[PDB]
Amino acid sequence: KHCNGILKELLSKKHAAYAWPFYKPVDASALGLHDYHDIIKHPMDLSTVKRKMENRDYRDAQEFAADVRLMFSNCYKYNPPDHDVVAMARKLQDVFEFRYA
Template sequence: FCIGALKTLMKQRSAGAFLEPVDPIAYNIPDYFEIVKNPMDLGTIMKKLRNGEYGTILEFSEDIQLMFDNCYLYNNAGDPVCCEAKKLEEVFRKCMKKAPASAVNLNIVSPEPFVSTTPKERSASISSVPETMSETEFKHCETVMKEMKKHKYHDYSWPFVQPVDAEAWGAIDYHDVVKEPMDMSTIEKKLYEHQYHNEDEFRSDFTLMFKNCFAYNPPDHLVHKNGKKFEE
């Protein structure tokens, strides 16, 4: 049950910010660990699950809830990441309704392989890249992804880190204009789930991300200008 529930959460568009541990440097939040004393993320939960560290479904669900609580504790209620957390938490609660009422011991023994979301395990997973993308292509795409996420670009990369939350940003007509939304967390997720068959597909999603930005925001808008700088 837990493996299935966790996979369901990790596949959600709203899961981007929760797939791996929060990097205070990358997100320019130096006080994060002063406020959040027990960090938690979906990648860490998957690792603990695979290592048999949860004895009951309750222990598993407590870590999921801790992840959401940390988000609400550190961020303001109206922040986009909190809106995404609310969506993901709703999915989680629906999953928990399907949990076997009598389940106490998870009895997890070598669950089916799953692509890790931690940087260290990602490197180890390269050998599982499908034949349609060579190891060289995968490594190059991974290098590009890491470069685009660097803190030095934060001043103009921030609008592209997570999916656009039209409601949170007051862009009610966003999905009328942008038919195929794209952002860096989605690109990264697709990369590590091996959804790209070649580098061209990977590159096309970045092109789509910038194209969407320019299509929706006028040239004099800050986000449009940020997009131009980031595209360079």
């Protein structure tokens, strides 16, 4: 439940300026995203984390935190380092990594 507060905070309006690329799964049907599943073998987003929490999939806080960082890891791996979305991931990850800390 310490993780549920972390999940609602990332999904709240306080971070909506940079958290919107992660609200839903990456739509690989966009103009130049047809290769996302060739490069990223374990996709992750916040709607799945909420759906894995409502279905109660996470056993402990180490299972919850593992998925959240994978969602950021996929963003850093797939996107160029100077893209806005990686900056949006860096900004949002700092919010996550110190509620979990």
